[PDB]
Design a protein around this motif. Structure first.
Motif, PDB file in Angstrom:
ATOM      1  N   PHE E  58     -40.560  28.973 -10.404  1.00  0.00           N
ATOM      2  CA  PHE E  58     -39.823  30.075 -10.650  1.00  0.00           C
ATOM      3  C   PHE E  58     -40.439  30.262 -11.822  1.00  0.00           C
ATOM      4  CE2 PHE E  58     -37.305  28.675  -6.568  1.00  0.00           C
ATOM      5  CZ  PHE E  58     -37.768  29.553  -5.168  1.00  0.00           C
ATOM      6  N   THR E  79     -38.579  36.089 -14.803  1.00  0.00           N
ATOM      7  CA  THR E  79     -38.856  35.471 -14.208  1.00  0.00           C
ATOM      8  C   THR E  79     -39.540  35.862 -13.237  1.00  0.00           C
ATOM      9  OG1 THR E  79     -36.599  35.404 -13.039  1.00  0.00           O
ATOM     10  CG2 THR E  79     -37.201  33.819 -14.689  1.00  0.00           C
ATOM     11  N   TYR E  80     -40.048  35.685 -12.190  1.00  0.00           N
ATOM     12  CA  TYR E  80     -41.144  35.181 -11.632  1.00  0.00           C
ATOM     13  C   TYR E  80     -40.122  35.134 -10.163  1.00  0.00           C
ATOM     14  CZ  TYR E  80     -44.913  35.581 -14.606  1.00  0.00           C
ATOM     15  OH  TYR E  80     -45.912  35.849 -15.484  1.00  0.00           O
ATOM     16  N   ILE E 115     -38.158  28.566 -19.144  1.00  0.00           N
ATOM     17  CA  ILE E 115     -36.725  28.285 -17.741  1.00  0.00           C
ATOM     18  C   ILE E 115     -37.975  27.473 -17.148  1.00  0.00           C
ATOM     19  CG2 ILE E 115     -37.583  30.287 -16.734  1.00  0.00           C
ATOM     20  CD1 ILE E 115     -34.730  30.849 -16.534  1.00  0.00           C
ATOM     21  N   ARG E 116     -36.913  26.300 -16.695  1.00  0.00           N
ATOM     22  CA  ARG E 116     -37.425  25.706 -15.369  1.00  0.00           C
ATOM     23  C   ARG E 116     -38.850  24.654 -15.895  1.00  0.00           C
ATOM     24  NH1 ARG E 116     -34.503  29.585 -13.263  1.00  0.00           N
ATOM     25  NH2 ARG E 116     -36.172  30.781 -12.637  1.00  0.00           N
TER      26      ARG E 116
ATOM     27  N   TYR F  52     -31.297  41.987 -11.715  1.00  0.00           N
ATOM     28  CA  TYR F  52     -32.326  41.601 -10.821  1.00  0.00           C
ATOM     29  C   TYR F  52     -31.917  42.244  -9.271  1.00  0.00           C
ATOM     30  CZ  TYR F  52     -28.072  38.088  -9.578  1.00  0.00           C
ATOM     31  OH  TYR F  52     -27.355  37.186  -9.583  1.00  0.00           O
ATOM     32  N   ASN F  87     -36.987  34.438  -4.577  1.00  0.00           N
ATOM     33  CA  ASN F  87     -35.750  34.251  -5.534  1.00  0.00           C
ATOM     34  C   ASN F  87     -35.810  35.525  -6.407  1.00  0.00           C
ATOM     35  OD1 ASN F  87     -35.630  30.635  -6.899  1.00  0.00           O
ATOM     36  ND2 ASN F  87     -35.166  31.548  -4.899  1.00  0.00           N
ATOM     37  N   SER F  88     -34.909  36.453  -6.397  1.00  0.00           N
ATOM     38  CA  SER F  88     -34.798  37.811  -6.603  1.00  0.00           C
ATOM     39  C   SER F  88     -34.745  37.057  -8.336  1.00  0.00           C
ATOM     40  CB  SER F  88     -33.077  38.045  -6.754  1.00  0.00           C
ATOM     41  OG  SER F  88     -33.674  38.802  -5.022  1.00  0.00           O
ATOM     42  N   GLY F  89     -36.091  37.450  -8.344  1.00  0.00           N
ATOM     43  CA  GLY F  89     -36.450  37.378  -9.993  1.00  0.00           C
ATOM     44  C   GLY F  89     -35.990  38.703 -11.429  1.00  0.00           C
ATOM     45  N   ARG F  90     -35.641  37.933 -12.116  1.00  0.00           N
ATOM     46  CA  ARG F  90     -35.328  38.920 -13.735  1.00  0.00           C
ATOM     47  C   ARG F  90     -36.476  39.709 -13.964  1.00  0.00           C
ATOM     48  NH1 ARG F  90     -29.726  37.655 -14.746  1.00  0.00           N
ATOM     49  NH2 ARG F  90     -29.951  35.615 -13.653  1.00  0.00           N
ATOM     50  N   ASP F 123     -26.428  39.871 -15.369  1.00  0.00           N
ATOM     51  CA  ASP F 123     -24.840  38.920 -15.544  1.00  0.00           C
ATOM     52  C   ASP F 123     -25.110  38.249 -16.918  1.00  0.00           C
ATOM     53  OD1 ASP F 123     -27.512  37.495 -15.540  1.00  0.00           O
ATOM     54  OD2 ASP F 123     -27.171  36.275 -13.940  1.00  0.00           O
TER      55      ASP F 123
HETATM   56  C1  LIG Z   1     -26.445  27.545  -9.413  1.00  0.00           C
HETATM   57  C2  LIG Z   1     -26.761  28.481 -10.486  1.00  0.00           C
HETATM   58  O1  LIG Z   1     -25.652  29.245 -11.578  1.00  0.00           O
HETATM   59  N1  LIG Z   1     -27.896  28.537 -11.147  1.00  0.00           N
HETATM   60  C3  LIG Z   1     -28.772  29.246 -12.193  1.00  0.00           C
HETATM   61  C4  LIG Z   1     -30.271  30.417 -11.886  1.00  0.00           C
HETATM   62  O2  LIG Z   1     -29.553  30.575 -10.820  1.00  0.00           O
HETATM   63  C5  LIG Z   1     -30.117  29.848  -9.122  1.00  0.00           C
HETATM   64  O3  LIG Z   1     -31.637  30.349  -9.265  1.00  0.00           O
HETATM   65  C6  LIG Z   1     -32.706  29.708  -8.863  1.00  0.00           C
HETATM   66  C7  LIG Z   1     -34.123  29.486  -9.255  1.00  0.00           C
HETATM   67  O4  LIG Z   1     -34.553  28.966  -8.467  1.00  0.00           O
HETATM   68  C8  LIG Z   1     -32.627  30.893  -7.592  1.00  0.00           C
HETATM   69  O5  LIG Z   1     -33.073  32.062  -7.933  1.00  0.00           O
HETATM   70  C9  LIG Z   1     -31.533  30.715  -6.515  1.00  0.00           C
HETATM   71  O6  LIG Z   1     -31.069  32.145  -6.509  1.00  0.00           O
HETATM   72  C10 LIG Z   1     -31.586  31.197  -4.469  1.00  0.00           C
HETATM   73  O7  LIG Z   1     -31.319  29.869  -4.484  1.00  0.00           O
HETATM   74  C11 LIG Z   1     -29.773  29.824  -3.650  1.00  0.00           C
HETATM   75  C12 LIG Z   1     -29.384  28.245  -3.683  1.00  0.00           C
HETATM   76  O8  LIG Z   1     -29.637  27.699  -4.747  1.00  0.00           O
HETATM   77  C13 LIG Z   1     -29.016  31.212  -3.229  1.00  0.00           C
HETATM   78  O9  LIG Z   1     -29.674  30.390  -1.470  1.00  0.00           O
HETATM   79  C14 LIG Z   1     -29.922  32.205  -2.561  1.00  0.00           C
HETATM   80  O10 LIG Z   1     -28.984  33.017  -2.675  1.00  0.00           O
HETATM   81  C15 LIG Z   1     -31.248  31.762  -3.665  1.00  0.00           C
HETATM   82  O11 LIG Z   1     -31.942  33.509  -4.092  1.00  0.00           O
HETATM   83  C16 LIG Z   1     -30.133  31.094  -8.257  1.00  0.00           C
HETATM   84  O12 LIG Z   1     -28.372  31.495  -7.594  1.00  0.00           O
HETATM   85  C17 LIG Z   1     -28.308  31.841  -7.756  1.00  0.00           C
HETATM   86  O13 LIG Z   1     -27.958  32.779  -8.487  1.00  0.00           O
HETATM   87  C18 LIG Z   1     -26.828  32.947  -9.116  1.00  0.00           C
HETATM   88  C19 LIG Z   1     -27.558  32.991 -10.817  1.00  0.00           C
HETATM   89  C20 LIG Z   1     -25.837  32.137  -9.071  1.00  0.00           C
HETATM   90  O14 LIG Z   1     -25.353  33.616  -8.809  1.00  0.00           O
HETATM   91  C21 LIG Z   1     -26.135  31.671  -7.647  1.00  0.00           C
HETATM   92  O15 LIG Z   1     -24.697  31.261  -7.184  1.00  0.00           O
HETATM   93  C22 LIG Z   1     -27.037  32.055  -7.059  1.00  0.00           C
HETATM   94  O16 LIG Z   1     -27.178  30.475  -5.821  1.00  0.00           O
HETATM   95  C23 LIG Z   1     -30.460  30.950 -12.544  1.00  0.00           C
HETATM   96  O17 LIG Z   1     -31.377  31.867 -12.316  1.00  0.00           O
HETATM   97  C24 LIG Z   1     -31.535  33.147 -13.205  1.00  0.00           C
HETATM   98  O18 LIG Z   1     -31.016  33.856 -12.159  1.00  0.00           O
HETATM   99  C25 LIG Z   1     -31.456  33.919 -10.561  1.00  0.00           C
HETATM  100  C26 LIG Z   1     -30.930  34.790  -9.452  1.00  0.00           C
HETATM  101  C27 LIG Z   1     -33.285  34.098 -10.445  1.00  0.00           C
HETATM  102  O19 LIG Z   1     -33.493  35.392 -11.118  1.00  0.00           O
HETATM  103  C28 LIG Z   1     -33.904  33.367 -11.815  1.00  0.00           C
HETATM  104  O20 LIG Z   1     -35.391  33.245 -11.555  1.00  0.00           O
HETATM  105  C29 LIG Z   1     -33.529  33.149 -12.879  1.00  0.00           C
HETATM  106  O21 LIG Z   1     -34.413  31.907 -13.615  1.00  0.00           O
HETATM  107  C30 LIG Z   1     -30.253  30.356 -14.412  1.00  0.00           C
HETATM  108  C31 LIG Z   1     -30.504  31.254 -15.554  1.00  0.00           C
HETATM  109  O22 LIG Z   1     -29.423  31.867 -15.201  1.00  0.00           O
HETATM  110  O23 LIG Z   1     -28.895  30.278 -14.560  1.00  0.00           O
HETATM  111  C32 LIG Z   1     -28.550  29.255 -13.305  1.00  0.00           C
HETATM  112  O24 LIG Z   1     -29.188  27.674 -13.317  1.00  0.00           O
END
Ligand SMILES: CC(=O)N[C@@H]1[C@@H](O[C@@H]2O[C@H](CO)[C@H](O)[C@H](O[C@H]3O[C@H](CO)[C@H](O)[C@H](O)[C@H]3O)[C@H]2O[C@@H]2O[C@@H](C)[C@@H](O)[C@@H](O)[C@@H]2O)[C@H](O[C@@H]2O[C@@H](C)[C@@H](O)[C@@H](O)[C@@H]2O)[C@@H](CO)O[C@@H]1O
Ligand SMILES: CC(=O)N[C@@H]1[C@@H](O[C@@H]2O[C@H](CO)[C@H](O)[C@H](O[C@H]3O[C@H](CO)[C@H](O)[C@H](O)[C@H]3O)[C@H]2O[C@@H]2O[C@@H](C)[C@@H](O)[C@@H](O)[C@@H]2O)[C@H](O[C@@H]2O[C@@H](C)[C@@H](O)[C@@H](O)[C@@H]2O)[C@@H](CO)O[C@@H]1O
Ligand SMILES: CC(=O)N[C@@H]1[C@@H](O[C@@H]2O[C@H](CO)[C@H](O)[C@H](O[C@H]3O[C@H](CO)[C@H](O)[C@H](O)[C@H]3O)[C@H]2O[C@@H]2O[C@@H](C)[C@@H](O)[C@@H](O)[C@@H]2O)[C@H](O[C@@H]2O[C@@H](C)[C@@H](O)[C@@H](O)[C@@H]2O)[C@@H](CO)O[C@@H]1O
Ligand SMILES: CC(=O)N[C@@H]1[C@@H](O[C@@H]2O[C@H](CO)[C@H](O)[C@H](O[C@H]3O[C@H](CO)[C@H](O)[C@H](O)[C@H]3O)[C@H]2O[C@@H]2O[C@@H](C)[C@@H](O)[C@@H](O)[C@@H]2O)[C@H](O[C@@H]2O[C@@H](C)[C@@H](O)[C@@H](O)[C@@H]2O)[C@@H](CO)O[C@@H]1O
Ligand SMILES: CC(=O)N[C@@H]1[C@@H](O[C@@H]2O[C@H](CO)[C@H](O)[C@H](O[C@H]3O[C@H](CO)[C@H](O)[C@H](O)[C@H]3O)[C@H]2O[C@@H]2O[C@@H](C)[C@@H](O)[C@@H](O)[C@@H]2O)[C@H](O[C@@H]2O[C@@H](C)[C@@H](O)[C@@H](O)[C@@H]2O)[C@@H](CO)O[C@@H]1O
Ligand SMILES: CC(=O)N[C@@H]1[C@@H](O[C@@H]2O[C@H](CO)[C@H](O)[C@H](O[C@H]3O[C@H](CO)[C@H](O)[C@H](O)[C@H]3O)[C@H]2O[C@@H]2O[C@@H](C)[C@@H](O)[C@@H](O)[C@@H]2O)[C@H](O[C@@H]2O[C@@H](C)[C@@H](O)[C@@H](O)[C@@H]2O)[C@@H](CO)O[C@@H]1O
Lengths: 135, 136, 138, 136, 138, 138
Positions: E58, E79-80, E115-116, F52, F87-90, F123
């Motif tokens: 991602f 991000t994608y 990122i990642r 997102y 996974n809902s990207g930004r 966020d």
């Molecule tokens: C745990 C946490 O807070 N992690 C942050 C990143 O978010 C997670 O990003 C991964 C990227 O692969 C994925 O998008 C996660 O969501 C998915 O998987 C989880 C289980 O792992 C659940 O099944 C969700 O329903 C799936 O959609 C994502 O975690 C989710 O959002 C965060 C923000 C918290 O609310 C957490 O509880 C949720 O589970 C975060 O990534 C960024 O935000 C996400 C939403 C996505 O837009 C990414 O592309 C972004 O980079 C990161 C940077 O902000 O910070 C932590 O690592």
């Protein structure tokens, strides 16, 4: 912004004996660029630092700031304190006016007139100027 | 913006009997911060509200606004109407000039000179000021 | 910006024989909106183009620009060169002051006073004005 | 000062399949009043907050800010990551340019073009704007 | 006033795989002339209209606006939505910040980070700009 | 002049599942000192660089700039290109509007809403800003 015009008629002096206000040659501001702007005002200063007036009945001179539509914005003048001055001296003169640039006026100019049959004279530097600001 | 300088030489009055323009000490504007700015213009006002001149041949005084490069931007003066004034009175004087700040000029100042062998005097408040604006 | 006030007391001329500076009624600028501003300065011009003074001991008139706290920002005046002028003539007068608007000032006004027991007169157009600027030009 | 224009083409959406840049109708700024002013500059923002593109080879859309004399001041674009998107989503787009107003240019306006044979679409609010300031 | 800088790195594209913020060369604003000026504020826009990021978890990119004294004024990123994008597309990005010019700040500039484990890329026009204004509108 | 408000809701992220526009708390500009001024205009930018949306029917989010007197000045939004994003990207988002300050407008502010049943999320840093200028430049 600033708008400004000056004259320095040393080689060919200016004068008038008109009872009515007439233009002072060259002392005109071009406000064209600012016409029809209801949000702008001009603060206008007419500076005649070195005039005199000749005559034999308490001579003097009057000045006005006037628009091209004939709106007299401000006026004033100088006079001597003796009926027949020995040699009429230089009596510095400045006049300040304001104008709303809402109208189509494109020129703001200096005028002058005599008093009690005098002849008013300018033979050196004089200016007219404005500061233009948003309301 | 505004630049400004004033004097009030009550305790040590200023005078000149110079036929040539000379500086009025203290009546100088520092426009250093604006030098070499082709988009800026100064509108300069010299205010000498209470001068007088002494003498016995239709005395008076002349004033000028000049740059540090010797450019005379404006000039003018007052004179009395009697050859030997009974008591030379105060003849208020203002002068307005403009200057393009494209050059390296850093000082715009007031000068004065006499006429017909007079002595010019300032013993009270006087000022020099400018409004500095962008050309558009 | 510009702030401006004028009078033209042709129908009811103004006069003073006050030896102390007193307000010229109608020549007042309200700067309340700009008070307590480190960032602003006012350049103030008092223009009395056509005053005169009557008297028999070298008459004249004095003018000042003052704040509402009584601070004199600028002063000056005209006088005649004869003890008893045949007919006191019009002696144009302009005065320029500066005021930092950092303080709690709300009014900048004109004042006048006499000299040697004269009476000063205004019977025509006069104004007080200011250009208010930021000390930083951007 | 501020110059501004917007569109909201809901009833009659806009589209292009042009490979070369063409005007987006209605997204033009008249800067005639400011032409020939070497001491003024414009900071121009093109805001296309909700575009999409259709097509079958990684579709997208390109945008530019151009003068009436054909000078391209800025360009950029969006694209999808899949070859044939499941359902072409809305990909917000903003572009910022600067232009000196020294020249006789009268118009600053938006243009768009396709990529890899796409069709670009606008069916809702979009704007072009400028802040005009003196250089000093 | 307006301050502005742009790049167009077509021949020599820019990239970063750094998890910590690093400067984007060429996207800096000199505010030296305006510093130590409590009366002035800058409104800063970072415009990266056509970035992309490559990677297999991602991918995406982050951007910040910062001062030369280490202060982070604004941040954000793209991000994608797929773990391994088929061909990472262009995701336009803009960021807006404000800064009081009271401090001795000399420069306001753009930074980016990954990122990642992604690699972020810029290969076309991008800009940073500011509008600088007095806190008082006169 | 510049008016600006920002949020950075890291510790308590914001969300909406509302089909109807609701205010984004903290993203409001006070223009009351400029209102009832026909000579002033505001150029307003809403910058949401890192939102997102979650959901399962082509999720996305919508944003608007509005006045306190119910005028929607601008609107737009983002959406994903898949029905069920892995996974809902930004998806960075900026919106620019204009407003004449001639009216008795007190406030210009941001709103958001969902689409197709989504939940929209913020966020991290976001801002709303305006440049206010006189209609005629001098
Ligand atoms: C745990 C946490 O807070 N992690 C942050 C990143 O978010 C997670 O990003 C991964 C990227 O692969 C994925 O998008 C996660 O969501 C998915 O998987 C989880 C289980 O792992 C659940 O099944 C969700 O329903 C799936 O959609 C994502 O975690 C989710 O959002 C965060 C923000 C918290 O609310 C957490 O509880 C949720 O589970 C975060 O990534 C960024 O935000 C996400 C939403 C996505 O837009 C990414 O592309 C972004 O980079 C990161 C940077 O902000 O910070 C932590 O690592
Ligand atoms: C004291 C007096 O009245 N002198 C008369 C002559 O005028 C002066 O002439 C000289 C040249 O010889 C010079 O022009 C004087 O003016 C200069 O200074 C003033 C400032 O005071 C201005 O800057 C002028 O532009 C300058 O040229 C001039 O005196 C001035 O004017 C007279 C009218 C009075 O106001 C006086 O107080 C001033 O100082 C006069 O000369 C004739 O008129 C002048 C203006 C000029 O055109 C000459 O060429 C003329 O011959 C003379 C004859 O009429 O009468 C007096 O002597
Ligand atoms: C009428 C006249 O000419 N008087 C001469 C004396 O001058 C006056 O002296 C008093 C103090 O006794 C006072 O200083 C006067 O000036 C004040 O008012 C003017 C405005 O009119 C200014 O604001 C001054 O700065 C103030 O101090 C002064 O009269 C003024 O000056 C004379 C030259 C004329 O222009 C007059 O019309 C003015 O009103 C003079 O005193 C000596 O010179 C003055 C300037 C001062 O230095 C005194 O301390 C000196 O004694 C006296 C002798 O030279 O001659 C006259 O009587
Ligand atoms: C030469 C002189 O001093 N004359 C005295 C009379 O004053 C003049 O009266 C006429 C009307 O008859 C006129 O009002 C004159 O002023 C006009 O011009 C000046 C500019 O010079 C101003 O623009 C005025 O606003 C205009 O009205 C006036 O002369 C001016 O004032 C006198 C005081 C001198 O300074 C002079 O040099 C000026 O030119 C005076 O009239 C009485 O006073 C005037 C001011 C006015 O109120 C009349 O209605 C009054 O009757 C007269 C009687 O006191 O005494 C002299 O004759
Ligand atoms: C999920 C999807 O792709 N839906 C397609 C239909 O498009 C949607 O139609 C509704 C009306 O029923 C609406 O117009 C949607 O757009 C609105 O919201 C977006 C913001 O997300 C914009 O602000 C638009 O201006 C609004 O009108 C529209 O979905 C949007 O566009 C599509 C292409 C995707 O980008 C999606 O994520 C967006 O949310 C589509 O309807 C037809 O096309 C639309 C654009 C409009 O012209 C309709 O009148 C048409 O019927 C339909 C048929 O092609 O296919 C999908 O259902
Ligand atoms: C669909 C795709 O992913 N294509 C890949 C190639 O990239 C494209 O290469 C062409 C070659 O001239 C061009 O550079 C494309 O970018 C141009 O358009 C975008 C806007 O969409 C930007 O304005 C760029 O600055 C322009 O140069 C480029 O496609 C774009 O980038 C890729 C990564 C995707 O985001 C796509 O959606 C964009 O449209 C790629 O070529 C190589 O990479 C590019 C970036 C460039 O460096 C070329 O010189 C390289 O050969 C190729 C090999 O990796 O893989 C795909 O075909």
């Amino acid at each position: 912004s600033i708008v400004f015009a000056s004259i320095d008629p040393r080689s060919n002096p200016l004068q008038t004996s008109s009872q009515n206000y007439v233009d002072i040659p060259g002392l005109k501001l071009d406000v064209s660029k600012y016409s029809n702007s209801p949000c702008l005002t001009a603060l206008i200063t007419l500076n005649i630092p070195t005039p005199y007036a000749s005559g034999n009945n308490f001579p003097g001179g009057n000045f006005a700031i006037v628009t091209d539509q004939g709106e007299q914005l401000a006026y004033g003048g100088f006079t001597y304190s003796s009926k027949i001055p020995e040699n009429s001296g230089r009596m510095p003169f400045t006049l300040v006016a304001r104008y709303s640039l809402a109208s189509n006026v494109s020129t703001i100019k200096a005028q002058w007139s005599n008093i009690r049959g005098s002849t008013v004279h300018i033979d050196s530097y004089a200016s007219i100027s404005a500061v233009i600001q948003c309301n």
